[PDB]
């Protein structure tokens, strides 16, 4: 009989049971969304949005809830650290419960459509054979999709009727769900401009409505009908799979490179912010300012926010994890419980030295202290014999400013070495590792996991699109060639 990999073909020419299996799939996906939300709420710790944000805790769908406006819980806490006295129906658990109920209702509808498959609606009135007017159905669906896209862009994300979307400062310090005005100029195509999202959705929804009306009206030509096989549902499947992996590539690139729709307060920093010294540059500019204004070094480093200092730390890099390093970043390096302050290194001569920061590629990196002019002045040698740049030989001390070690100066090499090795990773923090039994190895961010899953799905769906386009074009030779 059928091979195991062809069982689902039994609904190719059964529109009612195709609707039924679609409804079952939708029920499963909605139920997954609800159950995943409830899992993440059960395991989420909201007591420290600064040093333990959701992207340090392995939260995957919690950022997607927070992105569109759901920011309060029924547990009395807001995602921004405030107090929610009236979260309303649409809390995190409220959205979870709504998805569970939706899953159940879709399961019932799937049962009904499986039983009552033989609807005269699916019969062609001319010949009595089962058929689908796929151009007309596409017109209806495109019209509905355009209406929904326009409504989402004109009422939800603008704050006209909905709550808006999550918008933050460039350095991820003061983000919140805000209404967003559309940007109708060239800046509307700025990926990092939040105003591009409402403008895109309004314009694309209007275009989708107009094109849906066109596809409702105008029948396809015979040439293009036969060329694209518009009478076969597998042709629609191949083109749909093509569009879906195109979108998967787009969202994977957008999540990996960052955009206005992937905030760092929800998904974590990007690897390019570490590579290009984004937070390091901002921190050093904020320290250079108020030094020219006339503050000492002990202050104006205490003025630096711990959130920004935490952002400038390679352990929050999404490209420092592993394929089988599972779970939260907290399970990787502990829960961050305090910024120790900036570490300034000096030698016996008094010149200032800086630890060469670890690049993203390197699992391990040698500890190197470089002066202002780019000359290596100290290191932790691998060969502690005939060495010329060890911490002991150079006489390097370290002074901390702004954190829990503010004002303290360490001169013993055994501690200068460990603080330089920690400064290799960026800003130095203290981590509680006993709570989760962290193994001391870096994990990946939710944006990294999202990008990996969606790029893998995008390639597999490229193969699926190839297979189904092949099946559509070469249907008449699917069981073999004509032999004549």
């Amino acid at each position: 009989g059928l091979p195991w990999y062809r069982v689902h073909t039994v609904v190719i020419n059964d529109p009612g049971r195709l609707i039924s299996v679609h409804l079952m799939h939708t029920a499963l996906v909605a139920g997954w969304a609800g159950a995943m939300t409830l899992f993440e709420i059960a395991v989420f710790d909201p007591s420290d949005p600064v040093l333990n944000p959701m992207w340090r805790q392995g939260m995957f769908v919690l950022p997607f809830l927070t992105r569109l406006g759901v920011t309060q819980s029924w547990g009395g806490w807001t995602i921004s650290g405030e107090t929610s006295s009236n979260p309303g129906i649409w809390s995190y658990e409220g959205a979870a419960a709504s998805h569970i109920v939706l899953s159940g209702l879709l399961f019932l509808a799937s049962v009904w459509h499986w039983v009552y498959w033989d609807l005269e609606l699916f019969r062609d009135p001319r010949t009595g054979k089962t058929a689908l007017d796929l151009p007309k159905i596409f017109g209806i669906h495109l019209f509905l999709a355009g209406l929904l896209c326009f409504g989402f862009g004109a009422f939800h994300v603008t704050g006209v009727f909905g709550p808006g979307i999550w918008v933050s400062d460039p350095y991820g310090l003061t983000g919140s769900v805000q209404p967003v005005a559309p940007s109708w100029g060239a800046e509307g195509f700025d990926p990092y401009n939040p105003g591009g999202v409402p403008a895109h959705h309004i314009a694309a929804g209007i275009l989708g409505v107009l094109a849906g009306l066109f596809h409702l009206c105008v029948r396809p030509s015979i040439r293009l009908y036969f060329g694209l096989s518009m009478g076969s549902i597998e042709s629609v499947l191949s083109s749909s799979i093509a569009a879906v992996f195109w979108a998967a590539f787009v969202v994977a690139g957008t999540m990996w490179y960052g955009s206005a729709a992937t905030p760092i307060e929800l998904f974590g920093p990007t690897r390019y912010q570490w590579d290009q010294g984004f937070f390091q540059q901002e921190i050093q500019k904020r320290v250079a300012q108020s030094t020219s204004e006339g503050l000492s070094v002990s202050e104006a480093w205490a003025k630096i926010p711990e959130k920004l200092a935490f952002y400038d730390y390679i352990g929050n890099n999404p490209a420092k994890g592993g394929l089988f390093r599972t779970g939260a970043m907290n399970s990787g390096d502990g829960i961050a419980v305090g910024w120790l302050g900036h570490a300034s290194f000096k030698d016996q001569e008094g010149r200032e030295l800086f630890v060469r920061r670890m690049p993203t590629f390197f699992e391990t990196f040698p500890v190197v202290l470089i002066d202002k002019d780019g000359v290596v002045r100290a290191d932790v040698p691998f060969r502690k014999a005939e060495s010329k740049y060890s911490i002991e030989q150079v006489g390097v001390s370290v002074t901390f400013y702004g954190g829990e070690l503010n004002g303290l100066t360490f001169t013993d090499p055994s501690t200068v070495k460990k603080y330089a090795r920690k400064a290799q990773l960026g800003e130095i923090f203290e981590f509680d590792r006993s709570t989760l039994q962290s193994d001391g190895v870096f994990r990946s961010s939710p944006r990294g996991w999202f990008t990996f899953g969606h790029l893998s799905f995008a390639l597999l769906f490229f193969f699926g699109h190839i297979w189904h386009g092949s099946r559509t074009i070469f249907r008449d030779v699917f069981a073999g060639i004509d032999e004549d």
């Binding site: 010294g277 630890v355 470089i370």
Partner: peptide, 27 residues
């Protein structure tokens, strides 16, 4: 305020910083 100093101070910690990679034809 001193962009040259903040440039020469971000450079030894990270040579790939965009401040170092930007407008350095003048250097």
């Amino acid at each position: 305020q001193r962009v040259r100093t903040v440039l020469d101070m971000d450079d030894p910690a990270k040579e790939e910083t965009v401040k170092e990679l930007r407008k350095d034809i003048n250097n």
